[PDB]
Symmetry: D4
Subunit: 160 residues, 8 copies
């Protein structure tokens, strides 16, 4: 089936983080594509990807980047689709540079930003799912089940 | 007529920021409600608002809070709807406490976080609009027009006179 | 005996930190319960726990959380008991996110916040003990002994 | 009549912040004393105040300090009473130095720390009240009334007019 | 006559900062152009400006941006010319978001970053001048004179009167 | 051939970082010298190095330092050549001290600052190359090739 | 009569801060000189000042700088005298860049660093006084009197009126 | 011989850092004492130590602490001697808490603060030495030699 979510990242090194978004979308059976698109090394690839995303049938883009993290913001610049940004943990500054360069978008071009690291990648997929669930009843039911299981599965006490 | 976006905030002091979300939704002709829901002073009000939002017909919640900013995250805990968070600028720490309190949600319960302050509020409304536009062709057209006009309206050079 | 302190945390991963609170309360023979309550995954469990804490005979709640750490503040929202918050060290931001999301409570609903990590968990238990000692003479004497031993046991010089 | 809470601070400049603790204790009818004790300029005064607090009948100490804020931690070093710390906002670093200097106590000597500034001072008094209410039923009733009124007084919607 | 340095910025609000770069280039008689290019609102304008800069005869680009400051880095992505970045001071985070967004470029695409604010803008122009002076002897002489005068003009003692 | 770029650093411990600048200059066949010059321990060596750099035929200086990182700024003080600064990652503060002490130069004496760590060292060499390419056509072509290969070599998808 | 402390700073703008060091030395009757030495604009002036300070009879150097604050560290590089550093508050980063640039000296060349701003300048003078008092009994007596008076002058309670 | 410098620290865990101060003083043959004094656990020990330091013949105190680091400031409160503070690297916040709680002393009671960690401990000893050298000619000559050797020993190029 045709992808409705695009997951993009700038390098193989981002995959350790973004694989968590990929896994969640697969778990919820949301058709998606997972690609490398680098804002700095392949800016024309980025322009083409973002500009054509809507006409290709994409509904949400999840973009991960670390350091001076420009990939989500520049993606949002070229598409009217919702763009969700995952700050990848950077070696020196632990993703604080990633976080500020993604979340601090000036008014007019938004990026919905999630937590630094694996938690953010998982949550970007969940946020994408909740967006798609607004107009897909079967997915809405699967997301309901996912959240219910998450809630029900929390133990009552720690193991010592 | 019925609201499809809920804008919530903890206090009147937040309105100076959240009014920018309200204005943009109105500009794009998106029906919405604006309420005060305080995570710490009215936690049962929050639980009820969030847990009933979907059945009331809301599609997106925009939540603003400052300091130890728990309102967006706790809203997301009770709803399956997308929740967007606006960090309100705080006096001492300039919204850094607001930002980290909102964006650093552990995996399992998301909040899509926007920039600190008025920019974030405007962008939360634009993000909400982009979500709604996925299923609403008239709104999708209004949003494309809005984005195209924003692009066309950027001047080519600064005014450089003394 | 019935618990007078509740120790709560959002996940098993918090136990490495919160076990230090548990150990100290046991050392001082303070009856307590140690539970998992997750603000985000089990918010109704949290509401019920905090709302009924006083009528169950709890006197102090010690709550640990990391990241966007909402557990202590939301607990305080539903109870009139003193709530003490332990910021758990987070992977990327080393508990600075945990610390700010716990300590920066707006006026009207307090959380007494302790240091990031194991030190904070130990100190939350000690702070709970000093609260209980105000109206329990036998405990006050044991706490006096604990503090005296801590003071007396500090060596006079380092081992080389 | 005799004080059961001590509010201490290093200088008159701290009073702008600590007065919020004082006001709240008075509102809840909690007898207290307010003193200046400077950790660095009057260290022997601090030692004496802290080491005699319990025998003088104090139950809780609220200590405020800014910058390299050592007053709460050193107070806790000499008393077995619960000590609550209020980081006072500093000029350059906006109370971040105050906060870290107070909250990051190594294990063994606790300080329950509240928010930077006026919010923290008000909350230190509320936390002190919640501690005292554990053994004082009349105060417990006054505190429940206060919290209930705070909850009931939150408006349902912001004032949104231009 | 033709420009050899391009000064670009995302909005008119940046000019208060970037005007210091403009003034210094003029002082050193370096022909330049000043334009608004917004990375987020006019991304195709940016692509075209950056990809054609070298063939248009530009030698150095000075780019200023604040907040999530992507303009310098994205300019460098499309040009082989040296790109110098000026972090513009932002309201909440005082240009720290600007600074990290510009300087923390991953290996492979450089931006030479200067200080936050007006100092950085002046220094971007001086750095551009020092690059151009490597091949332009008349400019090298003007720059040496400028640096020598800066050194000679430092007073020996402060004015200490009350 | 005579060096046109100088790479300087304060200690052997900086070499793990600055070797990336050295490798890139060699890859692009840019003649250079790689030296230890310590701002604090050998300040007269620094003064002489920076003061004579231009007359020796150097065109760009790349200077790396960590902690209270004064080497780039003080180099710039004595030369009219462009000075590029690489913040070396420090043990405690992860190069945030290095970054601020290099980039925050007051107006009048510039240092072009690159990212913390190995990325910054590589990018300082690339920035130096782009400066030299302005007036060396053969190098400009090699830099074009380098950038083109970087762009072309980015994979289209991650390896799972 | 001859100076035993040198107070140096990079510009007149630093004097608003460094004047507090000057005033305290005068109060304690410590002969000193006050000069402008800019690490970046007058590096040879700095080298000469620092390398000759000991033979000129100086015992302590107090150096103030803001931003990328290199003056204290580079002074210490050329002198064997104790060098005390005062971080001057900067506009954007509130002296955090000043502080880290001064205090984070690698092992081998020390700078004793004081607080950001006016407090640090006053304390640099007091620290210089405490160093000089080790060998000067009259000054040691004046310093003890000063510290004793500081202690005696702390009020017992705040002024709490409305 | 009687100690003229006191090195104090709050716990054995600080010794890994403060041993560098001890080693430097021994290298320069400066008589000193190395002690554990904990501001929070042994405050009366601290009061007595600082109050009597001058009359015991101490000239400089070097105090190391981490976290909420109160030891140097409180030492300075009770003595007119120069007090030098070493921020010990803390687990979570990497000594940023240590640094701010030591350096940000309000006007009236100074602490001369050195770098976070081992570098700061070494430099506190060197700063103490330079203070003592003002009125001890033999030590001044040894310190001159130490600094000269440090300067002369810096290599001219890195080892590859």
């Amino acid at each position: 089936s045709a992808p409705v979510v695009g997951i993009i990242m700038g390098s193989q090194s981002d995959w350790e983080t973004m694989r968590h978004a990929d896994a969640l979308l697969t778990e919820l059976e949301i058709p998606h594509e997972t690609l490398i698109v680098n804002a700095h090394r392949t800016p024309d690839r980025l322009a083409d990807y973002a500009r054509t995303a809507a006409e290709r049938g994409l509904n949400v883009i999840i973009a991960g980047a670390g350091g001076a993290a420009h990939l989500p913001g520049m993606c949002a610049a070229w598409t009217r689709l919702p763009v969700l940004g995952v700050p990848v943990e950077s070696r020196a500054l632990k993703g604080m540079d990633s976080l500020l360069s993604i979340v601090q978008m000036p008014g007019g071009v938004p990026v919905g930003t999630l937590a630094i690291g694996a938690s953010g990648a998982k949550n970007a997929a969940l946020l994408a799912a909740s967006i798609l669930a607004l107009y897909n009843p079967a997915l809405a039911a699967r997301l309901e089940t996912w959240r219910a299981l998450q809630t029900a599965s929390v133990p009552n006490s720690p193991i010592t």
